[PDB]
């Protein structure tokens, strides 16, 4: 109602909501008013991304699936036979 | 209860020389055999030489790490009879300020009493209290500690004030109604007249009513509560600071000496370097009153070089807390023995996880032990407190004062079992073969 | 006003009535959904009713366990705006003594001030401050709290005394030189003169110079440092004590009432007994000024009988083969009790802040902390070092309960802010009105 | 299968700096120097007890 | 920073000959004791002889295993100052082609 072109769905303390329900409910309401939604958080594998899109999200937000890639900020180091970014 | 019952003739045991004549040992590889007891553990002298000219009542030194030793930690250590080494992970000015915080905490005559102008608000007095922990602010003409005493401000003078923007002149105690003493005053007389005063502070004024120095009742009470505090010739807490040996560190040293450090501790993983050697010679030539503890060592070969340069003490450890290093127990025994022959005390640095390891480390030849991780969670550490599931990263260990007392009683009880009333005695009897050990098989360690 | 933005017409969520209409739940089965925010979390009122006539600024109550609440813990709770319940695993007199410690700690006019006779040694005064922690001792004819005033003994009168056997009259400050007041005075004026005098104590005397009462500057500072302390009609901290409900316990209740308890808390596994019904009726009849928290209940059927017998409050919680899931029990019992104007105490199973929040949200007015408080320094017990850890006995050391209580307060406010209400009273009402909404979580939706 | 370690070029450079720092601690500016001083008794070792290895 | 400060006379340590004069040792059974430093580590010569007539700037050789060393691996190693050993789990022509690629 304030004018948002899009919505980020996701929260999670004692306050929040299970991610799959929130995407479906919010996206369904938003869709009836012609507003897309961004699934934010809890997207750990491809299947989750697929399910999130299927249930109403137009677009998924990748945080952790992208965490190690070379285009992220940080420097590389060799801790224990492993290449890590920090 | 005399020598006949104490001297071992059967000598059923293993001498330190036999014990350390093979592969390198950890502290768990051996155990100290019991001796003969004719005294309560309360009488055990645990003292050790931090350096040639500095004897510590508690042979405990706090590590120079940014997570362990700053002003508060260094103060606590000196109060309990040991000493702290202010870390060098800060600017030169920041480290020098920490040293002054330690040095100027306890003193007999306060030479530069904190002073304010009559126009300053109560808020700055309260800030001085919360940050620097100093009450009894002197209100003087111009705010300069140099004299012209107008009044004093104590906690009961401001605790009820609601407008913190008010000048102290409104609420302070004014010179007209103040008990003060004139310049030619001895400290003992000054403290006595102060206690009679029933006040917290006694300014010492020159004939022009200017402030020469100040006497604090808090310093009197501190002496009563911490009778074994490590102090210098002027009644200040002893304070060490750490620096590297690079050429830029010379300026850092100069500021550290100007701030009052009593010992300079060199920071290097291996200290047997041309750079550390030059540095020691430069410190000795430029600041003779200063004592230097030389870089970390594990071999007598390294120890020789640093002792030749003029090192007043050696810090022992490498790979204790890379294919280069040495097991701590062996390293301590070898280096501490060689250095003893040249009259140089040694500091055990690393691998000291409990009281027993600290006991062994002193028995094997270390004069004092450096506590890094055993002190990690105490409240005098630089860190901040937070709640994940329990605290107030590491676990909250409480006050380092209570922990230092626990270690002290630990050492005293270990010495009693070993059968010597002194750790100086234990170290000598170890070198003589009258204190004996027993290497433990791996199975024997599991049980 | 933003009513259009805060009131939910879509109502996308589950009401508490629907959520608790099925199998019994614990706090991890459900989540509170977010509301609407137009206020800083600092401005959230978390207060709740401990009983019909007692509102707690902090809706927290320390559990009446021998390892949690004695005099010091109950002091800490009341000072922070909560309250504590002195445990009943002790004798009548010991429990009464602890109650007195709490009640007489903070107070405006000290009525039976600790006084001494002039012949008493300095030793006893040090004992007074050591054992009891009081430093305003009055010296009087006959050492009677109502006798002629002769002097005061404060900390700085004893700092310097080496022969503690000496009479206290040697070092006291004589009544001849004390600033005092005369009987018909008002507490506001008495504290004003106390603040102006710069002293710690101000005695009020009758026309024969006999002591009538005492004014302490410490109570003035405690008021500033703890502006939200749970106080009674006379300026003392609120205190609560536990008891059983058998005939022998009537003597204990009489003792606790004389010692000044404000709330009597009945201790029972299941409070729905003929013995507790009779006990509650007896307490209300003979001690009308006592509010009663009735034994542990889990169901409305139980709640009905204890409320009908006269209980001012109910403890919810149970868990053998008998008990009930904690979240359901709080909701059901609190909802019934609320319709009859009786508050409820969530007892047990409160391990983190979120649980406390959920328990308050679902109907409990006040939460009882047992284990979250277990390690704090105000609990009974001694500290020891087992394995690189500071423990009390065992449990790990959580520091000061004061810092923990502030942490929980900030937590409650923050979760209240997300829920979108400026009050937990609002949250309770909006839950009952269906404007605060929940979501049951599937098992796989754990984290 | 194994984990992606990146480019062997970056790893070889890391090992190179590792060897250089180990040589510095040992006190010789050459590994030809280290090997010769080992044969001569001027580079010394210390066997570690099993306990010493655990720590 | 000369020979006097570097040569060990006390010889507090164990020689390799003493160290390896008993049961067989893994690399974790021993540790190298520190010496005397008068130089930055950037100046350390790490070179070793791969063979009599071949000196490697980096004393590193990639193993001849079908999961480690082929053309690309062998190229990288030689670039950095070492060398790779093309594996022999292939036909003669295939291995020769990998060598020409390097
Ligand atoms: N030398 C003095 N002469 C006269 N009055 C003094 C003197 N020193 C302090 N006072 C004042 O006497 C009163 C008693 O001292 P004071 O407030 O220090 O007790 P305190 O609670 O221990 O505070 P503090 O932390 O400063 O010691 C104060 O008003 C103080 O300003
Ligand atoms: N009403 C009074 N009249 C005169 N002197 C008083 C009076 N009350 C206290 N004194 C004396 O003032 C001097 C300073 O008081 P003091 O600071 O020691 O009190 P306190 O409450 O114990 O404060 P603190 O323990 O924080 O130092 C003492 O000699 C005390 O006996
Ligand atoms: N008035 C007063 N001064 C004190 C007291 N204790 C120490 N001081 C001195 O007050 C000074 C306080 O530190 P300060 O010089 O202001 O620190 P800086 O601003 O960082 O240089 C120091 O010179 C201390 O020695 C006290 O109890 N009362
Ligand atoms: N002089 C003095 N008395 C206090 C103070 N605070 C409380 N009291 C009183 O001191 C008494 C506490 O000690 P008391 O009850 O006599 O110990 P008991 O003999 O075991 O009963 C009570 O009468 C309190 O009211 C204080 O600050 N100064």
Residue numbers in the entry:
A (entry chain B): 309 to 320, 331 to 404
B (entry chain A): 2 to 322, 331 to 401, 440 to 494
C (entry chain B): 2 to 320, 331 to 404, 440 to 493
D (entry chain A): 440 to 494
E (entry chain A): 2 to 103
What does the publication say?
Here, we present InCellCryst, an advanced pipeline for producing homogeneous microcrystals directly within living insect cells. We have demonstrated the pipeline on five different proteins (IMPDH, HEX-1, Cathepsin B, Luciferase and EGFP-µNS), representing a selection of soluble proteins of different source organisms that crystallize in insect cells in their native compartment or, in case of peroxisomes, readily in the cytoplasm or nucleus of the cells. Importantly, as shown for IMPDH and HEX-1, InCellCryst can produce crystals from native protein sequences, without purification tags or even remnants of proteolytically removed tags, within a quasi-native cellular environment.
All IMPDH structures show natural ligands at the canonical binding sites 1 and 2 in the Bateman domain. However, instead of guanosine monophosphate (GMP) found in the IMPDH N-His structure solved from isolated crystals, the structures solved in this study allow a clear identification of GDP in the canonical binding site 2, stabilized by hydrogen bonds to Lys133 and Arg101 that coordinate the α-phosphate and β-phosphate of GDP. In addition, a phosphate is bound to the IMP binding site of the catalytic domain of the IMPDH structures. As observed in the previously published IMPDH structure solved by SFX20, the canonical binding site 1 incorporates an ATP molecule. However, we observed two conformations of the bound ATP, where the gamma phosphates of the adjacent ATP molecules are either opposing or facing each other. As shown here, serial synchrotron diffraction data can be processed by using CrystFEL and XDS. However, the identification of crystal wedges is a prerequisite for processing with XDS, which is mainly used for single crystal rotational datasets. Based on these results, in cellulo diffraction data collection clearly improves the bioinformation on natively bound ligands and their conformation compared to the diffraction of isolated in cellulo or conventionally grown crystals.
